[PDB]
Amino acid sequence: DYVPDAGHLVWLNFTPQAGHEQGGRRPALVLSPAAYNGVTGLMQACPVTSRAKGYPFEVTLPAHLGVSGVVLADHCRSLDWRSRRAEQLAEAPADVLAEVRGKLGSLLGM
Amino acid sequence: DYVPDAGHLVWLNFTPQAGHEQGGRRPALVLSPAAYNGVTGLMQACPVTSRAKGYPFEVTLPAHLGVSGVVLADHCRSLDWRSRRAEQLAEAPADVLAEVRGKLGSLLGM
């Protein structure tokens, strides 16, 4: 009965995807709250990749979480987290969630 | 040489998708700016349906844009717009963009 909540890092399959969208099973930083995620079966989450290109939209995860890679803030997507088999991994610190949101917000024109 | 820009309504294939994610070929409201869209080949956009479910995160498109329906603000996702074959259709008015952004921002925890 796990419902991802905002700030959770979950393992999720980003496949299926198209083109340059992130694919593959990897952590994902959940941005939407569990109340939405649980009522819809969807969530907004950003994939984490170990193939960091060092660009500013990549938000690094503190080593303490045990989740390698960077959050690709700009790659946030509406995801069916049951279909994509979300599995809880960890919880990101508030500052990572704030940085990802600020960067994604700038991308979305907020 | 079209690069989608923020506020554009484009026709796009939301397939491939998983599960409850919005699929199908339909309009999309682009939120991210062309500078990003053109450098990455990705964009953040929300799907449009001409058949509203009647929920608050739908944002109705005004008449006379030649694209009708509602923008599903909560279904925004990072999309490879070349893979999904974005075709420019129209430009949404600033108030639609702002309402979509405000709704999506609430979803994303901003």
Residue numbers in the entry:
A (entry chain B), B (entry chain A): 4 to 113
Reported in the publication:
A type II toxin-antitoxin (TA) system that responds to DNA damage stress was identified in D. radiodurans, comprising the toxin MazF-dr and the antitoxin MazE-dr. In addition to the well-established DNA repair systems and antioxidation activities, a type II TA system, the MazEF-dr system, is found to promote dell death through the endoribonuclease activity of the MazF toxin in response to DNA damage in D. radiodurans.
Crystal structure of full-length MazF-dr was determined at 1.3 Å resolution, which is the highest resolution currently known for MazF structures. Each protomer of MazF-dr is composed of three α-helices and seven β-strands, which form the typical MazF/CcdB fold frequently observed in published MazF structures. Two interlocked loops (β1–β2 loop) located at the dimeric interface between two protomers are fully ordered in the MazF-dr structure, in contrast to the high flexibility of this loop in its E. coli counterpart protein. In the absence of substrate RNA or antitoxin MazE protein, MazF-dr forms a tight homodimer in the asymmetric unit, which adopts the canonical MazF/CcdB fold observed in published MazF structures. Structural superimposition of MazF-dr with other MazF structures revealed almost identical overall dimer conformations as well as active-site configurations, indicating the conserved catalytic mechanism of MazF-dr.
